[PDB]
C-alpha cells in the first residue's frame, strides 16, 4: 500500500562525489555532451540505465582535460548514476 517517498527518483551526476565536473568553453560539458550523444543514439534501443552506462564510458575514456595549469591538466572524470527507481525505463513504447 505504501512506497518510499524518495522512491522513483533518478540522479544522473556528471561526477563522482567530491570531484570537479569538467566543461569545455567551446563544446560544452563532457557529461551533457556525452549524455545527448548516447540519448539520440539509443533512447530507442536501450533501457535508461544501460544508456547512462554508455554515457559513463564515453566520458571516462574519451575526455581528458588540457590546461596550462599543472594542477588542472590531464584530469579524467566519471559520471555517477544514482538510481532509486523501481522499474526499468524506456523512453519509447
Amino acid at each position: 500500500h505504501k512506497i518510499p517517498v524518495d522512491a522513483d527518483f533518478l540522479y544522473a551526476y556528471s561526477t563522482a562525489p567530491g570531484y570537479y565536473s569538467w566543461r569545455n568553453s567551446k563544446d560544452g560539458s563532457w557529461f551533457i555532451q556525452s549524455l545527448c550523444a548516447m540519448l539520440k543514439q539509443y533512447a530507442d534501443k536501450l533501457e535508461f540505465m544501460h544508456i547512462l552506462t554508455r554515457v559513463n564510458r564515453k566520458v571516462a575514456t574519451e575526455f581528458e582535460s588540457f590546461s596550462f595549469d599543472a594542477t588542472f591538466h590531464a584530469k579524467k572524470q566519471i559520471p555517477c548514476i544514482v538510481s532509486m527507481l523501481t522499474k526499468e525505463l524506456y523512453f519509447y513504447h
Binding site: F9, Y11, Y20, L35, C36, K75, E88, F91
Partner: protein, 145 residues
C-alpha cells in the same frame, strides 16, 4: 488477458512529461564566482535531444536561488496526471548536495523534495529524473593510464 509483468514504467501516457532545464551562466559579482562558458551549447543540446524524446522542454536561464525554488515549487504544483515522467536539468556551479542559483546556493534536497511521492501526487509512481552538471566538490581525478 495473459500474464502481466511490469518491470518497466508506463511511458505511454498522453504526454512524455515536461523537462525543466536551468541554464545558469552568469553569477552576481558578490557570489565571487565566474561565469560558466560552454553552458549555452549544453543547454541548446539538451533541448534538441529532449525535444526528439517528445519531452515538453522549458529552458530557464540564469535563475536566482529564489527563482529556482519558486519554479520548482510551482512546477511541482502542476497536475502531471497525463504525463509519464519528469526530467529536470540543472546546469551550474555546485558542491556536494547544492547547486548555485545566480546569487546563492540551493540544496538538491530542497528542490527535489517538492516532487516526493507525497508532495507531488500526480507524479507518484512516475519516474522523476534529475540530471546534474555541476561540481560536487573540488577533487581532481588524475586518472590511471
Amino acid at each position: 488477458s495473459g500474464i502481466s509483468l511490469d518491470n518497466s514504467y508506463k511511458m505511454d501516457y498522453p504526454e512524455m512529461g515536461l523537462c525543466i532545464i536551468i541554464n545558469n551562466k552568469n553569477f552576481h559579482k558578490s557570489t565571487g564566482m565566474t561565469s560558466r562558458s560552454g553552458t549555452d551549447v549544453d543547454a541548446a543540446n539538451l533541448r534538441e535531444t529532449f525535444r526528439n524524446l517528445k519531452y515538453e522542454v522549458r529552458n530557464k536561464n540564469d535563475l536566482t536561488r529564489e527563482e529556482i525554488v519558486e519554479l520548482m515549487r510551482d512546477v511541482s504544483k502542476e497536475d502531471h496526471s497525463k504525463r509519464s515522467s519528469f526530467v529536470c536539468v540543472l546546469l551550474s556551479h555546485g558542491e556536494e548536495g547544492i547547486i548555485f542559483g545566480t546569487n546563492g546556493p540551493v540544496d538538491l534536497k530542497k528542490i527535489t523534495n517538492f516532487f516526493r511521492g507525497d508532495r507531488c501526487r500526480s507524479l507518484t509512481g512516475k519516474p522523476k529524473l534529475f540530471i546534474i552538471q555541476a561540481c560536487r566538490g573540488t577533487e581532481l581525478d588524475c586518472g590511471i593510464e
